């Protein structure tokens, strides 16, 4: 229920700490805590790239007119993403994008 | 606990059969390697 | 049960020259032989001897019409040259499950020319390099083997 | 002689084609999605 | 979900979003109760979102559960998870039952 | 027909037949475990061969010390570490006389290089033992931690930039009464995590300050930790060993006997030249014999004191400060303390229990509870054990740390060339562990007398020849460091081969690195043309599998393969397409040093050339040789935790879990409906609830009263 | 030699040696530099085949250096 969530948010806002953490921490920062909560670094670079390539958007992308020139979709295949990234502070692109 | 040192065993007759059979020519192959550029130098021809 | 009982059941107490096939299976034998088959037999086409504990081939009627013979699950290990002097008209040979040591045991089959298929399964001779090729060039008369000469046909 | 008939069975490898006997019909595949039904001939 | 559908709570009815015209493997139209059962089981995240949330059961052992089934606070309205053992189903009389 | 592979040796010389027996030049995974037991055995053996020396108590570290140098000479063929100083000095004198102006020039060059070097050079190394945390860490991290601790302790050597101030600050830090430093401490966790309860326990690290007394730091600096290297040394030792090894390398480079730092076919040239030289000057009618000697317990017998003597003799005419700088390393090694590692494990089968006994508590339990071998080892190690789970170890060399100086000592042993003016002359080669000895005499009897004299001489210098792994034969056929020489022919025993997979940088970079690795393998390890071509084929296969860039004309299917196929269909110059774009590979031996872009430039489609080499493409953005195009992309490298202080203080407040719980329901009801991009989570929640209320009212889930109530509250939020 | 070390991987090995020569802007004797090699190949094709005369003349008559028969250039 919208009303229940609204009242719960108001009750939480009554407390200062929750209000502060919600005001400052961003949605991007929300993902970070979960990562270290259940993720860490790996090794074996040869296999690392093998895993990375199979993912959706492993390749970093620059920001500019050329970056936006390539489309979001192509013949039912995604190429890049709209929302900004955290690490690269920009868009991320799929491997197929390069081929495009 | 004491270390379980490996036991001592005599000659196993199945290793000879393994070597004999694995060296035979079957009816199927499982190797498909990519191509290489054209060979020009004599060393490349010898290697090819 | 004994070879005699099997002979009586198959022949049903009739003349020996009335059946062209025999089934001597699961029959105990004296010191590993194939007794109960007298030399008076004149016509025979198919044979079947399995789990008979046959250790040697030294007792067999002389024949000129047999084309198939089946031996399996036996500890027989000896020269088979006697088959040429007993019945040089074999076409199907089955030694699956027998106990043969080396290639020399199958040498005496060269003098036989009518053999076209030979079977040797889980035999101590079968586990060797180029056993398939070595046997082929050792028995040129052979036209079939365990089943993969060039294709697959059925007996 | 015909077309894909799942009833006759799946596609037959060259091993079974070579050991086939005349007057018997089999099924083969040209490429993905274009199967065909063939029959051996004496000639 | 099943207790939700069985209770015939008005919220469960108001949480429907698709359509109810399903059948069985034999091809028969069922009563609306079982149609709703199948609809909600197929789409579990239909009545859960609009059901409404309730503060966690503040107590020594009583603790809440969220819509994702994780042992997370801010539970569903009414639902409670007690860290005790509930033993039920006494007097299995096997009373006389007829068959139509 | 029972195959017998060894029968090949009948038809082929064994030197060629056993070529490349081990595909791996590194370490296998099944090697005997190198744990606490192995290091205990190593220290036991090191002290066993030198137990006839002088045993005393160090007045600095308070540890047992054994000094075998100038000790009684051996009376048995067993390994001995008693190296007389006079023999070593005489051997160095002979080497210097034979090579006039060699020691002086090498020392001058080493000191000049040290003067011009920088602290950053220390970062080029394997795992280093960090003392602040007492573990194994990368070289850069260890150097940074040491620098930070020095700064905390009013030591700023790294600020000056030079290596000399850094080492001066190291030896000064060895004098501070109390040393303060940073360390990492892990504390358990209480933050939520969705498995079945929204609660998980883990470990979070924090930086703390810790102080240690003088003796503790002294012991820590000399400690050697264990991870065929057996142990690693911290940063306090790295600079001095670097300088000493540079000196030894300068000396060795001009020593014809030295087999280092030769690499490649130069090794074969040196081998053949040595054989030819020895045969040429053989006495008319004499006999030449060759020994493929091996050294047992090489690093368990060499003494750091003998290395100190060698360094002093070499730098006899040099500035006093440089002499001290060179001497600082041997003295540090002469006081090395070994760390025994993790410890042992003891179990109880009846109760199905097990536990780990760490090194400090090694003797905390009766010895009867250890198996026989461990019981005996602990009984023998008791005298050389410290209460802090460390073992004093004066002698030994724990594998390679003064390999160049070891080679210099071996060359000195080989340079005597005669004892008693008998009728034999010896020489040969040696590379830091193995020596090939050539002796020319009249008859084999005199050759063996000379071999015996050489054996005794090397015994006097502490070098122990392996009688159980050495043999002698007429010169012309022998071995030297896994390289069999036989009447001109030369073969390798173990050759490193390319490993599966790409280098792991990017398409063009990976291709270039693979090709250059193949080229280097051909040049150095001697890989034949056919083997190199097969390696190229395997690398291409692995590359295509990893990057999903199969041939454009292939029939494989993939997300990237559709675009590749379309490009292959639209392209005219199909020979010019890169392999990464499903094109044909054209690499071969003659063109293993040319980037594929340069190779295919002349055949590329001009439109394809423009697209590929576009000066401003969005992929490239901002050793090996390649071309900067659209295939030089960079992968996202951003992980771990930043904003550590703010995140830690937020997570330690209280209400974070409630915020996560409220976030989870709404933002997991849908797979992705988050207005991400630095949006405050409260703002995203406000927008999400606004949209949810709008949809509920539009579909009729809520009446107008609830609608207005929700907007009222949303109005109170601030984002509406 | 600076130009010889770069190709060393394809020149010298443990038990083999490849005779290789460098190049670089040696243009001017183009036609000649062509015919020779072409002619060489013809011999290489004829010596292996039986009766090299007719085959050699046949191949020589049916070869063109991109505009003209080999006979005119020779």
Report what the structure shows.
The structure is cut from a larger assembly and holds four copies of chain A, one copy of chain B (48 residues), one copy of chain C (155 residues) and one copy of chain F (720 residues). Chain A has helices at 2-14, 16-24, 27-38, 45-54, 65-69, 95-99; strands spanning 59-60, 73-74, 77-78, 92-93. Chain A is mostly helical and 100 residues long. In chain A, strands 1-4 form a two-stranded antiparallel ribbon. In chain A, strands 2-3 form a two-stranded antiparallel sheet. The N and C termini of chain A lie far apart (45 Å). Chain B is mostly helical. The longest helix of chain C has 9 residues, at 3-11. The termini of chain F are far apart. The interface between A and F is large, with 67 and 78 residues. Chain C: This is Acidic leucine-rich nuclear phosphoprotein 32 family member A. Chain C: LRR repeats lie at residues 18-38, 43-64, 65-87, 89-110. Chain C: It is found in: Nucleus; Cytoplasm; Endoplasmic reticulum.
What's the SSE blueprint?
This is part of a larger assembly, with four copies of chain A, one copy of chain B (48 residues), one copy of chain C (155 residues) and one copy of chain F (720 residues).
Chain A: H1 2-14, H2 16-24, H3 27-38, H4 45-54, E1 59-60, H5 65-69, E2 73-74, E3 77-78, E4 92-93, H6 95-99
Antiparallel strand pairs in A: 1-4, 2-3
Chain B: H1 13-22, H2 42-47
Chain C: H1 3-11, E1 24-25, E2 49-50, E3 68-72, H2 82-86, E4 92-94, E5 117-119, H3 131-138
Parallel strand pairs in C: 1-2, 2-3, 3-4, 4-5
Main sheet properties of chain C: 5 strands, parallel
Structural class of chain C: little secondary structure
Strand line-up in the sheet with most strands of chain C: 1-2-3-4-5
Biggest chain pair contact, residues each? A-F, 67 and 78 residues
Q: Compute the gyration radius of chain C: what is it? A: 16 Å
% residues in beta strands of chain B: under 5%
The count of DSSP E runs of length 2 or more, i.e. the number of strands of chain C, is: 5
* SS class of chain B: mainly alpha
Total helix count of chain B? 2
Strand segment tally of chain B: 0
Multimeric status of the protein: part of a larger assembly
Spatial separation of the terminal alpha carbons of chain B: 57 Å
